[PDB]
Amino acid sequence: KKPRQKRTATKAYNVTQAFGRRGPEQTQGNFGDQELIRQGTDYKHWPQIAQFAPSASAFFGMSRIGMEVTPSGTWLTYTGAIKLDDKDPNFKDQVILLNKHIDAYKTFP
Amino acid sequence: PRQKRTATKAYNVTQAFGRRGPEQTQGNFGDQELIRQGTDYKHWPQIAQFAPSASAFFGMSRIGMEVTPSGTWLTYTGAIKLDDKDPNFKDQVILLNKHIDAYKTFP
Numbered sequence: 573k574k575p576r577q578k579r580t581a582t583k584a585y586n587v588t589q590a591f592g593r594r595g596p597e598q599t600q601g602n603f604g605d606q607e608l609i610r611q612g613t614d615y616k617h618w619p620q621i622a623q624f625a626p627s628a629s630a631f632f633g634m635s636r637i638g639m640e641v642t643p644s645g646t647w648l649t650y651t652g653a654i655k656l657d658d659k660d661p662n663f664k665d666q667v668i669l670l671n672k673h674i675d676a677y678k679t680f681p
Numbered sequence: 682p683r684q685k686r687t688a689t690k691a692y693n694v695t696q697a698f699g700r701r702g703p704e705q706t707q708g709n710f711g712d713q714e715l716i717r718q719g720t721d722y723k724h725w726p727q728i729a730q731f732a733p734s735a736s737a738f739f740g741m742s743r744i745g746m747e748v749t750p751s752g753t754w755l756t757y758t759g760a761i762k763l764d765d766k767d768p769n770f771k772d773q774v775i776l777l778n779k780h781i782d783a784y785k786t787f788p
């Protein structure tokens with residue numbers, strides 16, 4: 573299997589198979605409701621979320637990058653913020669869609 | 682949008698993503714040569730090897746939303762573990778460390 577950062581989740585190799593379970597810890601992802609976790613890029617509204625992911629150039633250009641070492645190895649750390657356009661005609665739906673998936677695991681039944 | 686921009690010799694890292702610096706939403710990555718070249722940089726493929734796919738970006742990161750006087754911001758934090766079994770591991774560690782906070786050494 574490809575290095576983690578190059579994995580593409582789909583129904584056949586889903587979000588928790590490729591990127592681990594959702595949770596509150598620093599090395600855990602917190603994004604994705606039950607539908608997105610199970611479907612990955614097969615998720616119907618996936619393109620509306622992917623529009624906000626950065627290109628390789630923007631990931632290294634916009635982010636604060638670091639290099640940390642832990643008992644498990646060497647990690648490339650990254651942090652940043654992407655400004656949405658609150659004048660985009662779909663701004664209201666984009667906010668609803670992102671929030672729907674942000675910390676969705678906290679209310680899984 | 683800014684997150685889909687591609688920096689090149691004609692539209693460099695500073696023009697596309699702002700000057701490097703120490704602040705929280707300020708990019709700190711790139712020596713003068715990478716800032717000048719962007720994706721045209723001699724070792725750009727070795728750097729792009731660490732950039733996440735859209736799926737890994739939303740799968741690995743801690744995503745949030747912050748609404749302030751400047752707008753609505755999608756925040757992100759995470760860490761990508763290097764594979765110490767990758768034959769390029771030594772070069773990857775040296776290359777990343779070279780460009781992290783390189784701006785501190787020049788105007």
Ligand SMILES: Nc1nc2c(ncn2[C@@H]2O[C@H](COP(=O)(O)O)[C@@H](O)[C@H]2O)c(=O)[nH]1
Nearest residue numbers: 634653654655656683684698699706707708
């Ligand atoms: N750091 C950062 N600045 C941004 C982003 N989007 C827009 N800006 C800033 O927003 C300001 C207003 O310009 P505009 O948004 O109309 O292009 C600019 O000075 C620009 O740098 C973003 O995602 N990140």
Ligand SMILES: Nc1nc2c(ncn2[C@@H]2O[C@H](COP(=O)(O)O)[C@@H](O)[C@H]2O)c(=O)[nH]1
Nearest residue numbers: 576577592599600644741760761762763764
């Ligand atoms: N959160 C996180 N865990 C990772 C990453 N790469 C590997 N791991 C985890 O690190 C452990 C060691 O696996 P290895 O990749 O060294 O065979 C496993 O628990 C694996 O899931 C990564 O980029 N992020």
Ligand SMILES: [Cl-]
Nearest residue numbers: 685686687688
């Ligand atoms: Cl561009």
Ligand SMILES: [Cl-]
Nearest residue numbers: 723724726727
């Ligand atoms: Cl190269």
Ligand SMILES: [Cl-]
Nearest residue numbers: 712775776779
């Ligand atoms: Cl060098």
Ligand SMILES: [K+]
Nearest residue numbers: 588593594677
């Ligand atoms: K989970």
Ligand SMILES: [K+]
Nearest residue numbers: 627628629687
């Ligand atoms: K790119």
Ligand SMILES: [K+]
Nearest residue numbers: 639640641642
């Ligand atoms: K460290």
Ligand SMILES: [K+]
Nearest residue numbers: 620662665666
């Ligand atoms: K939408």
Ligand SMILES: [K+]
Nearest residue numbers: 580734735736
């Ligand atoms: K993808």
